[PDB]
């Protein structure tokens, strides 16, 4: 059945989208809003009032207070906009390189393990956005490794904190320790923690 | 005077100025001229401008700007000072402004020379420095009076 | 006495092409020159393959010069926001090791 | 408790949004070890050079910075249509 309208120009629209992405900052957000809105229309998640962060009694337990203070330090209140966005952004195109909101964690207390888990969850619930901010995560996890597994840490960092990938596909580690910056997200270098090379 | 060319009615003057401006050895201009974008933001930063001005004041202004730009010290470096005045192992974050916010390097040498001179000329300066530290300890809330 | 005389008799004469003793402005008054990479000012080169004479190297006055200046994008001396984050526990803090 | 909601519902929503017309970039190959985004620039001999992805830092759009702690409300204070007992 012949709809009397011009064919949707895939070529012209991908070109104009590339142009917009080069020139119109709002475009990212524009597209994101659509996805955010779609997530909202699907009714996939809603924020309930009752937090379930702790086992019964452990919150009121006196020796648990450090851990509980820590989990309270990481447990942001549920907000539909923030969640819908967090989910929607997993698929939306990214034009300005994303940065991890930085976390200051010395990893002294065992409860500091919370932060590690906070990343693991982020790695699972949102693998893509994770791939974007992963080196900026690696800067935190390296403090955690040097503080929790110092010898293994020394070997790993001796191999190098980063690597490239030659034409063969073999990884090539720097041999050097250096703090990662998202300036590196757009370069040959990769955070070494996710090399998954034994 | 180069602007009088083909505008002054005094013909000998215009003839002379035209002869000078047509010499290979001299060329009048009005800026803007030189332009320098940031390596990342791609926006313009420093720019030349051939002003009508005495060469001396232009030399001095150029010296000032050269000082400020060649230092390679952005505002981010201030964090290093804030660390010195913060409890050990506080961390500061952001916002990574970069080259767009140049600032002079702290003049450690001049300041230390001046400090020596000041302590020598104003021994009471001791009392000011102490006073600063005193207030800081008060802010640290590390010890309080009690009636008991 | 007139050691500061840039110009004299900016006026026409009927009988003669220029009034006697009229003083034209110096060529250096008008050579806008260039900013050397070092930031010293230079007069325009007198010939190809020659660098320009610096304006301070000589005693002539030059009334066009190339002043570099920052644009609205570069800003200096503005105050700067940061997120301080205190140590979690004052007793865990590492006073000692270098 | 919430895993059936993420796998058996939210994943389908990802699968559909994955096809929406304006999700034009490829974002991640599923391989953290190797993946880099493909990188295009508008560019001309006349000197123009506009990267499509660039790192200008935090911006007013409010999308440049990620708070990972969003995971916590998701794992705790958030109900789902699949938990719980019925919900269309």
């Amino acid at each position: 059945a012949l709809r009397p309208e011009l064919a949707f120009d895939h070529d012209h629209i991908i070109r104009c989208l590339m142009l917009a992405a080069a020139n119109y900052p709002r475009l990212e957000g524009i597209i994101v809003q659509i996805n955010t809105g779609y997530v909202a229309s699907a009714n996939v998640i809603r924020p309930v009032s009752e937090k379930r962060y702790f086992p019964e009694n452990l919150e009121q337990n006196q020796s648990a207070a450090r851990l509980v203070s820590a989990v309270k330090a990481r447990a942001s209140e549920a907000d539909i906009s923030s969640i819908h966005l967090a989910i929607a952004r997993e698929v939306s195109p990214m034009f300005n390189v994303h940065e991890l909101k930085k976390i200051a964690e010395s990893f002294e207390d065992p409860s500091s393990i919370v932060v590690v888990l906070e990343f693991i969850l982020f790695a699972l619930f949102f693998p893509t956005e994770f791939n974007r901010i992963k080196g900026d995560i690696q800067n935190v996890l390296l403090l955690f490794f040097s503080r929790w597994y110092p010898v293994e840490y020394g070997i790993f960092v001796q191999r190098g904190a980063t690597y490239t990938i030659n034409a063969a596909g073999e990884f090539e580690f720097s041999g050097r320790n250096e703090k990662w910056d998202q300036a590196l997200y757009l370069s040959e270098h990769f955070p070494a923690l996710f090399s998954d090379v034994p | 005077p180069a602007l009088l060319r083909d505008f002054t009615q005094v013909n000998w003057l215009n003839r002379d100025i035209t002869n000078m401006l047509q010499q290979a050895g001299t060329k009048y201009g009005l800026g803007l001229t030189e332009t320098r974008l940031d390596y990342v933001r791609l926006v313009k930063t420093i720019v030349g401008h051939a002003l009508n001005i005495d060469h001396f004041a232009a030399s001095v202004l150029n010296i000032n700007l050269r000082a400020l730009m060649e230092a390679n010290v952005t505002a981010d470096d201030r964090i290093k000072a804030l660390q010195a005045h913060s409890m050990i192992s506080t961390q500061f974050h952001g916002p990574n402004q970069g080259a767009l916010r140049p600032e002079l390097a702290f003049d450690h040498d001049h300041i230390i020379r001046c400090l020596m001179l000041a302590a020598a000329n104003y021994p009471r300066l001791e009392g000011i420095i102490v006073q600063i530290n005193t207030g800081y300890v008060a802010s640290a809330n590390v010890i309080r009076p009690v009636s008991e | 006495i007139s050691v500061a005389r840039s110009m004299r008799a900016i006026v026409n004469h009927n009988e003669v092409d220029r009034p006697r003793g009229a003083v034209a402005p110096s060529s250096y008054e008008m050579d806008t020159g260039t900013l050397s990479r070092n930031g010293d000012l230079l007069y325009s080169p007198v010939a190809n393959g020659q660098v320009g004479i610096p304006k301070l190297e000589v005693d002539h006055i030059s009334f066009s010069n190339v002043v570099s200046m920052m644009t609205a994008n570069i800003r200096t001396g503005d105050d700067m926001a940061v997120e301080r984050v205190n140590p979690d526990d004052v007793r865990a803090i590492n006073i000692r090791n270098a | 408790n919430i895993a059936v909601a993420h796998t058996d519902h939210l994943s389908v929503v990802y699968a559909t949004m994955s096809n929406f017309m304006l999700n034009f970039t490829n974002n991640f190959s599923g391989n953290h070890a190797t993946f880099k985004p493909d990188q295009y620039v508008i560019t001309s001999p006349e000197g123009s050079y506009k990267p499509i992805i660039e790192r200008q830092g935090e911006t007013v759009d409010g999308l440049t910075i990620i708070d990972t702690s969003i995971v916590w409300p998701i794992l705790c204070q958030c109900t789902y249509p699949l938990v719980r007992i019925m919900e269309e």
């Binding site: - | 804030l82 974050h93 952001g94 | 940061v82 | -």
Partner: peptide, 15 residues
């Protein structure tokens, strides 16, 4: 506490 996608600045350094 509340989620905030951006720098949560407090201190203001002087030049």
């Amino acid at each position: 506490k509340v989620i905030f996608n951006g720098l949560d600045v407090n201190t203001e350094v002087q030049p």
